[PDB]
Design a protein around this ligand. Structure first.
Ligand code: UDP
Ligand code: UDP
Ligand code: XDX
Ligand code: XDX
Ligand code: MN
Ligand code: MN
Lengths: 279, 279
């Protein structure tokens, strides 16, 4: 039911670029304190700039390490959350960074790549844009790869329960994906870590499976977070997914008991609206 | 909001036994292929038999290893699913084993202990029965301990979303707990791995928090399953939890893509009814 490219696409950078046909391509790297990895990621993509890729920015989501200076030193344009859209006060979380990035880019096609990847392949961007460039009706491309605890324990089983039509999607939460600006500026953006699952469900509801493709990127490595930070992420994924399914979420943050101690993590039920309204 | 015993209970086996006041206590160990651990678990509890504990059975849920012979050799009464309730054909899964165990025991109080625990403390059963024996209105006692991936990523965040009143429960899926027969024979039993979360939500809805206590067992160790088996368990926990919250579940099993291969795991939306109807 779902256009899946199972092996390495056969296209080439010169073919894909020809297929642009006046369309532009922006790449956004969201980054929060990724000084150890930001440079390797930027370098994997910057050789494409002024060719297949027209624009690369790092959206610096409030880093307090050396993320920004190392990104500048790799030749990337770095855009803070405030600069992307300064009339609107900044909220925390990943979804805010990606939503704002629409105002700081102008490509007809937008590619998101996480900045915490350990040594990413230089064809990620070409592999993701393939179906948007050479297909018909594809508006969103998700990646899969490779062990993804939230994906396999939370998102895929809840999708099977509540949107089983998306059961064929191998990595619904994947941070590497591309989509048309027309789609992205028409969809709301869930806060925090809810943004990927929200975009997938909203895209499906509006365009169906035929507008979605997925592409094998082989294997990917990244910062494996401790279980407690995953708990808050799972809570936000659940909150965003239930809302899309018409189920009322309590809005109560996850509490954890670490001779134990207690901490309550934030959860948000507030989406950003389609960036179109900002026109 | 929730009666919590945070340090080691101060009671003694002789005090607790005196407090029985004619009430009986059954212990059930569900077991599916636990030959490596069944013996250490039985031995931790059998010294209590004919004193605090009136009855110990192993409910052999279809083992094909040496579980049954090793349990017999530790002096335990072993009851198959068929023998517990032979007029009713056997279904797979943990919940079926626990539900049937009500027909093969007669204690006024029933204690469940998983049979895959690595070296369990001999006071587990005394610590769990404490609040049922010495409290008032306690009808269910859950344990906590100790890293519990389904609990921290699936069950606690979904409870926070959908039954936030149970947010103070530290280990909702814990396999070690005790309850009155009157409660257990009044509640349905969810299939598979849904049984613990189902019993907790059903108990709360019927009796509120004041009927539930929890007790610190310190640290517990057990067979840490691979992520893919956890995926099917999470799917069933989600299915049981959504049903209790009035949310329709698709009934679609989780599919996993392991040059990948596909497998679909069973999920069940069929509860067993209150054992009372079998009277
Ligand atoms: O408020 C935030 C949180 C995260 N990120 C970025 O979003 C990406 C994915 O975040 P994370 O690693 O925490 O998620 P994971 O992939 O580990 O589940 C990373 O490049 C982060 O730098 C961000 O820009 N802003
Ligand atoms: O169909 C089944 C599945 C499991 N069990 C028992 O239920 C307990 C808990 O099962 P499991 O270890 O798979 O769950 P976990 O604690 O690892 O999440 C164990 O003693 C199993 O032997 C059972 O009696 N029947
Ligand atoms: O899927 C997951 O379990 C997590 C983290 O992966 P691990 O459990 O650390 O292997 O990462 C997912 O979610 C993130 C936030 O939504 C995305 O940025 C990742 O790309 C996605 O894989
Ligand atoms: O909470 C969990 O993640 C799992 C398995 O624990 P691990 O992730 O292997 O540490 O076990 C829970 O669920 C089982 C089935 O419902 C219960 O039998 C366990 O007692 C409970 O801890
Ligand atoms: Mn990451
Ligand atoms: Mn276990």
């Amino acid at each position: 039911p779902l256009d899946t490219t199972w092996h390495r696409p056969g296209w080439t950078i010169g073919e894909l670029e020809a297929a642009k046909a006046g369309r532009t391509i922006s790449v956004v790297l969201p980054a929060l304190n990724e000084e150890a990895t930001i440079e390797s990621v930027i370098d994997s993509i910057s050789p494409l700039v002024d060719g297949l890729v027209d624009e690369l920015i790092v959206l610096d989501s409030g880093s307090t390490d050396d993320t920004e200076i190392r990104a500048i030193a790799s030749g990337a344009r770095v855009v803070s959350r405030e600069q992307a859209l300064p009339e609107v006060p900044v909220r925390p979380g990943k979804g805010e960074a990606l939503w704002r990035s629409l105002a700081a880019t102008s490509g007809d096609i937008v590619v998101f790549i996480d900045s915490d990847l350990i040594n990413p392949h230089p064809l990620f961007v070409p592999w993701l844009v393939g179906p948007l460039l050479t297909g018909e009706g594809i508006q969103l491309v998700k990646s899969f790869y490779r062990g993804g605890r939230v994906t396999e324990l939370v998102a895929r089983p809840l999708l099977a329960a509540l949107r089983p039509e998306l059961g064929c999607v191998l990595q619904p939460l994947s941070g590497e994906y591309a989509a048309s600006r027309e789609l992205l500026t028409s969809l709301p953006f869930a806060p925090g870590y809810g943004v990927e699952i929200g975009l997938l469900i909203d895209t499906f509801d509006r365009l169906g499976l035929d507008a979605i493709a997925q592409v094998n990127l082989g294997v990917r490595a990244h910062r494996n977070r401790p279980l407690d930070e995953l708990g808050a992420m799972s809570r936000q994924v659940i909150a965003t997914l239930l809302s899309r399914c018409g189920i009322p979420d309590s809005g109560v943050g996850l509490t954890q008991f670490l001779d134990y101690t207690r901490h309550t993590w934030p959860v948000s039920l507030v989406d950003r609206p389609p960036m179109k309204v900002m026109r």
